[PDB]
């Protein structure tokens with residue numbers, strides 16, 4: 083297996099995820115990381131956030147027909163990172179141009195009129211940091227916002243502002 | 254001189270901790286980690302676990318007259334690591350012959366008849382990987398139960414038999 | 425993909441190896457590889473080398489009471505590789521710290537004053553490429569000399585000199 | 596349980612040992628003694644031997660990151676006995692199974708080709724009677740050679756040849 087490490091990720095089974103059915107693999111090492119917000123309900127507790135990860139994947143699978151939840155990872159306001167498709171399966175979160183080359187991470191909540199908690203922001207930079215040590219993320223990765231790659235109000239005005247402060251951020 | 258990738262930790266200020274007055278330092282890199290429990294109330298949300306961290310620091314400072322919360326780090330059932338004395342300052346968890354040469358991390362609860370949740374064990378484990386990365390812990394660090402070094406039930410029968418299965422455990 | 429394409433290993437039965445009794449397992453992909461030497465005599469032909477794998481095993485099972493020969497794999501100077509405990513079973517070749525997290529491979533002979541023949545060094549390097557192909561070793565695994573983790577002269581001055589050269593050597 | 600001032604053992608401070616960090620205890624009376632050699636360069640003076648004792652500890656502590664030199668006592672060709680981990684701390688000389696139930700004395704030098712001088716042999720035997728008088732060793736203790744418990748050339752051929760004759764040896 084993988085003795086409980088990296089960025090404290092809540093595994094798929096722990097948030098009661100329907101089994102993935104995706105097979106498109108992503109080209110390690112990855113250059114881009116796109117940050118989006120789900121624009122759904124936000125939660126703060128491990129209990130409420132697992133239920134939300136479940137709810138997001140369910141909308142992507144039962145309704146949109148996708149092979150699994152779109153994002154490679156979801157960040158809850160509880161400060162935990164939720165495993166979506168992982169570092170190896172091409173996501174689906176920023177269109178055909180970016181899905182095969184960037185890793186998508188999504189903040190659960192609407193951040194148009196709100197900001198995620200520091201802990202959520204920590205879990206997120208931390209998550210990327212742990213990407214690098216695995217080979218999934220190339221040490222000198224670039225971070226784009228959803229707006230920057232596709233006409234979307236995502237990840238929200240207030241969260242978008244913060245994303246720009248980040249070091250690895252490109253234009 | 255390696256200061257990158259590693260874990261997220263709720264910092265002192267975020268859990269509204271009274272300032273530390275401790276000043277004696279540990280010698281890097283530390284060889285031992287001693288795991289304990291607080292035999293106190295458990296908490297399963299970021300807000301409830303901050304209150305709890307606070308109640309532990311409180312009792313150690315206001316009642317036992319220590320310079321700060323006794324432990325170097327505490328773990329919450331919410332899956333987050335709470336900062337205590339940190340990697341560099343000598344804790345006050347395991348007696349006078351062990352405090353000078355070890356990091357003491359304590360799970361917040363009474364583990365005698367319950368096990369902490371996977372997210373807790375996961376956080377505790379990343380934390381240790383981090384200490385190694387930062388160079389605060391020897392690469393071949395050794396994990397010990399509180400009871401292995403002091404006469405006590407800490408960290409509780411259940412959590413005790415769990416940590417015995419840890420890669421770094423050495424009776 | 426690229427169908428396996430590795431493995432010219434003389435199996436247990438081919439060298440007559442007493443049945444193994446060991447049951448404890450390694451978890452793949454393994455990260456470390458420890459190179460040792462038998463310090464005993466060498467062999468330079470198939471029945472000759474097959475004779476030693478049997479002696480070496482006899483010494484570990486009969487004289488020390490172990491469940492099987494210590495190494496995961498032995499390297500004869502006939503240029504063949506001999507199945508030891510293999511890729512999945514915990515060896516006994518480099519102490520309680522490294523045995524559970526490494527594959528021990530030992531050159532049959534004593535390389536303090538001499539080197540193993542090119543054939544032998546190829547058999548060894550090729551064996552490792554194989555381990556990676558099978559997912560039994562981390563693509564970025566590390567090669568340590570026995571003396572780098574245990575107090576011994578193993579694997580002999582000259583051979584130690586050679587492995588320090590290997591791509592995956594990390595002292 | 597009488598005196599005496601048995602054994603003229605050179606204390607750690609006198610050969611300038613680095614502070615030990617070991618804390619695991621041996622339970623007295625210890626039933627076994629394991630004889631090894633350091634397989635290295637030898638010394639025939641109180642001056643060079645104190646130096647060799649230093650080197651050996653340096654290897655175990657700086658290269659191998661151990662809590663102290665591995666043996667409980669070291670015997671020099673100068674006819675003296677250097678304190679290692681002493682009678683009460685569990686050594687790191689012959690593996691997980693024998694370390695907790697034995698005392699490991701080691702002769703400084705390589706004895707595959709030479710026998711150690713009578714005064715080294717005298718130091719060793721007296722060391723052992725001493726352990727019995729203090730009650731650290733059972734009066735009926737058994738002497739095993741290093742190669743009899745772990746795969747190794749240690750204690751070297753000629754010396755292995757000698758300890759096999761000893762009153763307290765046991766197959």
Ligand SMILES: CC(=O)N[C@@H]1[C@@H](O)[C@H](O[C@@H]2O[C@H](CO)[C@@H](O[C@@H]3O[C@H](CO)[C@@H](O)[C@H](O)[C@H]3NC(C)=O)[C@H](O)[C@H]2NC(C)=O)[C@@H](CO)O[C@H]1O
Pocket residue numbers: 120121122152192194233234235236237238
């Ligand atoms: C994975 C997923 O389904 N995510 C959904 C979120 O993307 C969605 O946020 C809203 O997405 C829509 C686009 O699908 C954004 O709308 C577009 O905005 C542009 C201008 O920026 C406009 O020109 C488009 O016409 C408009 N299209 C639509 C349908 O509105 C919208 O601005 C995003 N709003 C926010 C707050 O992110 C949320 C909305 O609840 O649902 C997710 O499932």
